[PDB]
Every structure is written in C-alpha cells, then in structure tokens.
Design a protein around this ligand. Structure first.
Ligand SMILES: O=C(O)[C@@](O)(COP(=O)(O)O)[C@H](O)[C@H](O)COP(=O)(O)O
Ligand SMILES: [Mg+2]
Lengths: 482, 139, 139, 139
C-alpha cells in the first residue's frame, strides 16, 4: 500500500530494528591498521552474560557512528569508512572477566587540532554504557598526521632550558605555603626567600587564584619584585608560576596579559579549566613567549582506579598535544599515588621523540611524536632532599623537582630550605656523572650525609626528615611486572 | 657574591680532576664539548665568547682539559664555562653547562627600578663590574 | 516561465522513455535514486518533499519509474524531480537532479528591492504561486 | 494544515468532557486557568487576546467550561486556548497550554526568503490568513 511502506529498506543490515554492534561492522578480527588511524586501547569489564567481542564492538560503534538501532541514514554516507573497528581482544593477565580491547578510528572522524573533538568521540558516552560494568581508556596511538595539526608544547623542554640558561641538573621548585590565606605581600616574601636560597622557581598553589585574602594583581606585582630581587642577588634567571586560572576565558587572558606585561617568564593553569581553555592559553603562550605550567588538578578523580577511568598516560599525550610546557607526572616516593613503572612510562611519553612498545611501563602502542616538542615533567608532593638519590634514579634529567613543604618546613628558614635541596641535588648529579652507584641504599644516603658535612642547612633537613616515607600500596599498577 | 649560573655552582669550585670526570661522562655519552669566556655575568648574556671551535672529533678528555688551560692562560679575568652539546634529534642543544673559573671579587648586581604605569615597575639588572669598566678589564 | 532548475531543463520536457534512460544510467553507476515533490519553486528551497525513502536496494529502473508515476498521481499540482545519490568517499552527495514534472503554467518570480545602506539593495525573490496560496493548492 | 501549538495538538480535537478533565487536573494542582483567543496563528504571537481576567479564586471546573462556551459563541472564527498558570515561587509561569478550538480550514504559512550577507538568508514566516484580512475576519 502506502509509499513509506513500499520503500522500506528490506536488507539484513538496514531493515529497521536492533542488531548487535558486532554484526553492524564495528568488529573485524583481521583489520589491518593504517598509519593514519587513531588507535585506542580500552580495559573493558563486560556485564555478566555480555560477550567480550560484543562489548568491544559496542564501544567501537558508540564512539564512532553507531546507535542502539539501525538507521537508513547510514547509507547517505560512506559508512564502511567511518565505522571504527574493534580489531583485537586479549584477556587482561590474571582475570577472565576483564579484557584489553584495541579499537581503530579513521583519521577523518576527528576535527583537526581539537582535543575537545578527540575526547568527544573517545570518552563521550561509552563509559556510562549499561552493557559494560567498568571501562578504562589505557592508551592511544595518535597518528603522525593528526599530531601535525597540533602545536605541541609552546616552549618545550629544550627552549625552556635555553631561556633559563640552566643545563645539566634537574630544575628545582617549591609550592608556596600555606596553600591559602597569605597576602600578596607575604607571597612575594616567600618567593624572594626561596629563589634567593637556590630555587629556580616557586609556584602559586593550584587553588590560589584571586580571593578575599589576596587579590591576583597584588600577588603578581609583589612576586615580580621578589623574583627580580632574587635574580639580581644571584645572576640567574628566576621565576614563579603565576596562576592565571580563572572562571572565564576573558579573565584568564587578562591575567596572562598581566603576567606578560610585568615580565614573568612563566604562568600556571589548572587542568580543571578544561581542554578548550587549555588549548587557547597554550597557543597564547607560544605567541607571547611564556612558559606554561599545567597543574593537573582534578586528574585523580578519573585517573586513580585500575578498573575504570582514563589512565594518566593518555592525559600526558593529550596535554603534550595541546601544548603545555610542564605537567605534573608524579614522584614515586612522595605523598601522591605513583608506582615507579607507571611514572616512568608517563615520563617517557612526555619526553621521548617516539615510543616503542614496553608493556611494563604501560606503553601499549608504539608511536611517533611527529617532532612535537617535549613536555617537562614535574615531580611534586611531599618529597624532601633525603630522597634525592631516589628522585634522580627514578625521574632522570629533564624534570622539575618541587619541594613546597620540604623547603618552607625547614626550621632555619626558607633560604636554608632551598639551599639544602640544591646542594643535595648538585652533589647527587655530580656523583652520578662520576660513576658512583648512587641508587644503592647505602651509597645514596651517604653521598648526602657527606654533602651535609659542608652544608649546615642540609644536615638539618636530613636530621628532620630522613625517617619520612609514604610507604603504601598502589592503586594504578601495571599488568606486566619488571 | 657568587654567580650561581652553571649547574654545579652550589658546590665548591671544581678541580681540574673533577672537571676531567665531568668531561669523561659527556664524551662517553657522545656529546660535544666547548669552552667559553665572559666578563659580563648578566643572567641574559646568552653569548659568552667562543674559545676556538667545539671539539666534536675528540676521543680523549685530556684534549678538552688541555684547551681549558690554554683558555685560562690567554683570557682576561672573568668567567669560563665548559658546555656539553647533544646534536641528537629532539635535543639539538646544550645538555650540560658549568663554571670552571670565576674571578675572586664578584660584586654582583643591583636592581634598577623605573616607574611604569600605575604600580608597575620596569626592572633592569645592573652589574657593577660591567658599568665600571670595559670588557677585558672588569675583574 | 519555465523553471530552469534541474540539469536538462533547457531541453523539452523529458518523455517517460527519456527519463528511464537517465534513471538506467544513474543505476548502472551504482547510484541511489529518489523522487521528490514541491510546489515552492524558489531557488533556495533546498528541501523538496521526499516521496518515501531513497530506493537503496533497488536494481530495476522500472520500479523507480513506478514510484515516479505514483508520486505523479498522489501529489498536488507542482514539480517533481528525480535525484541520484552517490554515497562514495569523495562524493557523498547528489550527482544528478532533473525535473520530471512541471506545472502547466508557472507565473515565476519577481525581484523585491529593499533599500540598504548607500546604494546597496537588499534583494528577495518572491514566488507568485507561493505568496498567493498555501502548500498543496498553489497551481 | 493543523496548527500544532498547544500540548495536545498531535491528538484529535478535545471533547468538552476531555477539556473538562484537563481543567480538573490543573485545578486540583491549584493552578489558575484562563481562556485566550486569536486569529494570528504565527508561532511568535506571544499575546493572544484575553477572555476576561484569569479565573483565580475558582474551585469548580464547570465554571471554566461555562467561560469556554461564552468565548466560543462570542469570539470570531479562529483559535481559542486554555492556559494553566502556576504562581508558586520558581515557576511563576504558565505550565499547560492547549488548543480547544481551531478553524475548519487553516491555510498555514509560507517562508519568505531575503538574501543576507554571503549565503545567509533572512527568514520571515507569513500567515496566509493574516495577510489576506484583518483581525476579526480571517477565517
Ligand atoms: O598542593 C600540593 O600538595 C602541592 O603543592 C605539593 O606541595 P608540597 O610540595 O608542599 O607537598 C602540589 O600541588 C601537589 O604535589 C600536586 O600533586 P601532583 O604533583 O600529583 O599533581
Ligand atoms: Mg599545590
């Protein structure tokens, strides 16, 4: 009878009704990956009774073109081409209800230079799907071709060191404390003292923006005085991460422009600003000769648990793409969650020109960085100079070691605190380069106790804190040991 | 004051033998060494004076050390550093830089403040050595 | 006037035999045919009315012609066009549209002029059929 | 065409028994009913003409139906609707509006297209009934 009825689609695939995502062409056991594909590795915990291939295909489809029922509108497009392929599923080591699922997405699916669009597809909906009890994005292969649309770090490790005139040892910093309550005046005091005592940097706390107790312009002006006073006293380029985090993008710029205008070398942003402001202020930082330090605030809400979320290693990739110059990536031995293996992989992702597969470090995909610049990892949170031998071994050369409490907590004052940390650092590096087995539980502590014999502030820091450790079990562990 | 540029400047002035070991490290890593001189200690003095060309071909620390001491004997009073340079892709930069020599009497700097708009200040870091005398007779 | 949208509208109205030959060409290339109806002849009326779905799984020009003839019987006086959709990467669009039916008498358009800044005119094209009567009763 | 303003216009016209029932639901929720008339069916015609004040202090549905019938008899051909108003904090607005009367024939609208900048079109929606005749004599 009626025209709607005579022209119904009657094929197996585009007849109306629900068919499984695997039978919609989102699964292919022998897809061959192209060098232009976005690859994603997911850790999928299917619900009781849901097939492991089905859940992998479901994730492929709802992150590319599918929906829950069949649509004739597919056929207005080159739908073979746009469909993502779940193309491999292994079971997760030592578990028969959790799976590693590899999914490949066609290059053309993604807006050029838009982390917002990349994430809209890849994390948009699928983590809240009913058929899946848990889901974690473990890794991604960002293809060269997509990477070339992005800026990468504004300054990057190499140019940063050049603007600083500091090569050979890890760089040094401290978060100003207490976190909140200090007036701009006193902030400028802490910054002057710490920088004058040996620190390359200080920083605003992540949550120091502009508050009744201290409005932002006061902090910036008073810190600049402190910074330039420090550099006049030492003959070093100095700085402090002036926090430009704000409610609106107009305010963030206003703060960035103010930082620039008064001569600041560096500014910080919080991750809670979100990806679009981050990309904006990363382009801005390139164009205005500014270091951009990303504090990763909020990360561990999705990054902490192994069964579900986004692994921080993917956040590394996305943030290096967007173009931040620094990003916090963990300490191993401090107050914040850090397994040595996972931190090492984070550091490789941020620093290397390319990645080779290394499953113990959580590097699931091999990947070229497409001459995007290298992002400076930051090691921060409850660390002290008694741990310096551990810091050097675990974290390498290109890194900023931050000691907020480990500098300011020092009983002989802030300058004493800073000096203890830099002597610590320099002697440890000096020693490594000479061939000494610095990481040995005997030698390492001894190199510092020897350095302490000619540095008063160091003896004191060793005396005060050498018991201190944060010896707890990890949540984010590897599935392959070393 | 002690000029704390370079990466080992919160340690004591390095001996020839301690410098040879740092040179050894750098040569075993494939890096290129060079030696440079200045008597402008300003933090923004990017370009210190080259002492010859960088030593790319060299297979023996003693050569760097021999050049260091030739530079020591020819250059006026001031600062000498040795840099290590990594031509590798994704580095292409200095990876090590430390002071080998520093004059006995470094007065340092004063901070020079010019009034900008509102409360803003225009800072210039000024060196006593440089303002009093020309290059070659500052220390 | 003659509405000269479609790719064969400077030729005489196509016979059914000529239409089928163009349908047969489009379908030999693997293209999806559809039938559409309008009584708004405006140049910028992108969306004519669908006569069912595009005929995706249809191999027979005669079936396409049947839907053309059923559209012709059921639709109010107006225009009918046939399009051919190509879903291939590189195209993903219509590649052939021509008019199969046209009204006996199309009054056409007038150009409405509104004064803009300076000498600029703001132009609107007005269909006589559309302004006078609603959809379904314009011809 | 049907005029699909109001929240029940995808169902057949409401019987007096059905209208009375929706009116009862609204009145049990403590909302104020009012009756409104127009012969401008335009989607942007905010203000239909008031049929009295809203019936605020009223607790019997038949009193609303009585006013509905006086409106039906007194008012010209066109549209009538009943609205329900909630004056509670955080609402302060209509929370139910539906058509109780529509004309026997509604021609509907056309889309007037004026060329803006570039490809931009400046759109205007035009009622056939409104353009042909004044308020009071359009249907
Ligand atoms: O607020 C804090 O706790 C810190 O200022 C550390 O201060 P201390 O150095 O005084 O501990 C840093 O922001 C965190 O380490 C960030 O964590 P992560 O580095 O994991 O992003
Ligand atoms: Mg902090």
């Amino acid at each position: 009878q009626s025209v709607s009825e005579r022209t119904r689609i009657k094929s197996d695939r585009y007849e109306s009704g629900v068919i499984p995502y695997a039978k919609m062409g989102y699964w292919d056991a022998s897809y061959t990956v192209k060098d232009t594909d976005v690859l994603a590795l997911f850790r999928i915990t299917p619900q009781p009774g849901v097939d492991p291939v089905e859940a992998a295909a479901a994730v492929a489809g709802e992150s590319s073109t599918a929906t829950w029922t069949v649509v004739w509108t597919d056929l207005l497009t080159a739908c073979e081409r746009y469909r993502a392929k779940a193309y491999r599923v292994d079971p997760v080591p030592n578990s028969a209800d959790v799976f590693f699922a590899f999914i490949a997405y066609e290059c053309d699916l993604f807006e050029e230079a838009s982390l917002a669009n990349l994430t809209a597809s890849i994390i948009g909906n699928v983590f809240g799907f009913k058929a899946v009890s848990a889901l974690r994005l473990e890794d991604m292969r960002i293809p060269h071709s997509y990477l070339x649309t992005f800026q990468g770090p504004a300054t990057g490790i190499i140019v940063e060191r050049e603007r600083l005139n500091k090569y050979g040892t890890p760089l040094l910093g401290a978060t100003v404390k207490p976190k909140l309550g200090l007036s701009g005046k006193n902030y400028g005091r802490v910054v002057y003292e710490g920088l004058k005592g040996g620190l390359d940097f200080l920083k605003d706390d992540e949550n120091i923006n502009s508050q009744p107790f201290m409005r932002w312009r006061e902090r910036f002006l008073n810190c600049m005085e402190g910074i330039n006073r420090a550099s006049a006293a030492t003959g070093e380029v100095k700085g402090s991460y002036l926090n430009i985090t704000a409610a609106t993008m107009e305010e963030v710029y206003k703060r960035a422009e103010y930082a620039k205008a008064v001569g600041s070398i560096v500014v910080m942003i919080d991750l809670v600003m979100g990806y679009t402001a981050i990309q904006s202020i990363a382009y801005w930082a390139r164009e205005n000769d500014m270091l951009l330090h990303l504090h990763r605030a909020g990360n561990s809400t999705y990054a902490r648990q192994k069964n579900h979320g986004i692994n921080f290693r993917v956040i590394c990739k996305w943030m290096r793409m967007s173009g931040v110059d620094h990003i916090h990536a963990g300490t191993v031995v401090g107050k914040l969650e850090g397994d040595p293996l996972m931190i090492k992989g984070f550091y490789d992702i941020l620093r290397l020109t390319e990645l080779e597969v290394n499953l113990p470090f959580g590097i699931f995909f091999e990947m070229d960085w497409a001459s995007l610049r290298r992002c400076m990892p930051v090691a921060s949170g409850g660390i002290h100079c008694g741990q310096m031998h551990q810091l050097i071994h675990y974290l390498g050369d290109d890194v900023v070691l931050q000691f907020g409490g480990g500098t300011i907590g020092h009983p002989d004052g802030i300058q004493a605190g800073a000096t203890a940390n830099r002597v610590a650092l320099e002697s440890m590096v000096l020693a490594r380069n000479e061939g000494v087995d610095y990481f040995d539980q005997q030698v390492g502590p001894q190199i510092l106790r020897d350095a302490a014999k000619t540095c008063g502030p160091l003896q004191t820091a060793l005396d005060l804190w050498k018991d201190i450790s944060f010896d707890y079990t990890s949540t984010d562990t590897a599935d392959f040991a070393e | 004051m002690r000029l704390t540029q370079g990466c080992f400047s919160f340690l004591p002035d390095l001996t020839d033998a301690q410098i040879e070991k740092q040179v050894a490290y750098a040569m075993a890593k494939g890096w290129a060494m060079n030696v440079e001189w200045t008597d402008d200690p300003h933090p923004r003095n990017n370009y210190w004076e080259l002492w010859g060309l960088p030593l790319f071909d060299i297979k023996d620390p003693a050569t760097v050390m021999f050049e260091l001491n030739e530079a020591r004997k020819s250059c006026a009073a001031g600062y000498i550093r040795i840099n290590a340079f990594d031509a590798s892709y994704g580095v292409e930069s200095c990876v090590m830089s430390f002071i080998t020599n520093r004059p006995t009497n470094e007065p340092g700097f004063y901070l020079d403040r010019t009034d900008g708009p509102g409360r803003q200040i225009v800072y210039s870091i000024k060196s006593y050595s440089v303002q009093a005398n020309p290059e070659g007779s500052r220390y």
